DNA sequence: CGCGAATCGCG
DNA sequence: CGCGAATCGCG
């Protein structure tokens, strides 16, 4: 069963690798709680990893016990492992997304949190709230 | 289209 | 038993 007082996080990709963005929405209202403006180069999985960790930070800050839903097995696994196992090359064009990912890993390694990270089951529940786009 | 997680042959 | 190559959801 679905927990409706939750945060749903989603990533939007223009080609992959390519321009990526993400946002966190209230699972019920569809209300946008946070949004990352387009990053010129990243991957789907990187952007979704960032989205979940931003969601963890947002909720921790606010004292919320709301859980986070994501439809990405990969991004959930990476957050649980505290390591984003991306293939994306490290060069000049990808330095911003990798700096962000590196810092999100550092956050996970130096912080505790109680937020449950749950798999959104698209095939039973339809698209994640506000799926890009 | 590509990204990464999660059947095969082999010894 | 484990090692690595070679279907899936997702945007």
UniProtKB/Swiss-Prot annotation:
Q: Which reaction does it catalyse?
A: Endonucleolytic cleavage to 5'-phosphomonoester
Q: Which residues bind Mg(2+) 2?
A: 10, 48, 71
Chain positions recorded as Mg(2+) 1 binding sites: 10, 131
Question: Where primarily located?
Answer: cytoplasm
Q: Which domain of life is it from?
A: Bacteria
Q: Which co-factor is required?
A: Mn(2+); Mg(2+)
GO molecular-function terms, A-Z: metal ion binding; nucleic acid binding; RNA-DNA hybrid ribonuclease activity
Top enzyme class of this protein? hydrolase
Q: List the GO cellular component terms.
A: cytoplasm
GO BP, one example? DNA replication, removal of RNA primer
The record's keywords, sorted A to Z, are: Cytoplasm, Endonuclease, Hydrolase, Magnesium, Manganese, Metal-binding, Nuclease
Give EC number(s), comma-separated: 3.1.26.4
| Function text | Endonuclease that specifically degrades the RNA of RNA-DNA hybrids.
Instruction: Give the family, as the similarity comment puts it.
Output: Belongs to the RNase H family.
Protein's recorded name: Ribonuclease H
Query: What organism does the record attribute this protein to?
Result: Halalkalibacterium halodurans (strain ATCC BAA-125 / DSM 18197 / FERM 7344 / JCM 9153 / C-125) (Bacillus halodurans)
Question: What gene is it encoded by?
Answer: rnhA
Residues of the whole record sequence present? 62 to 194 of 196
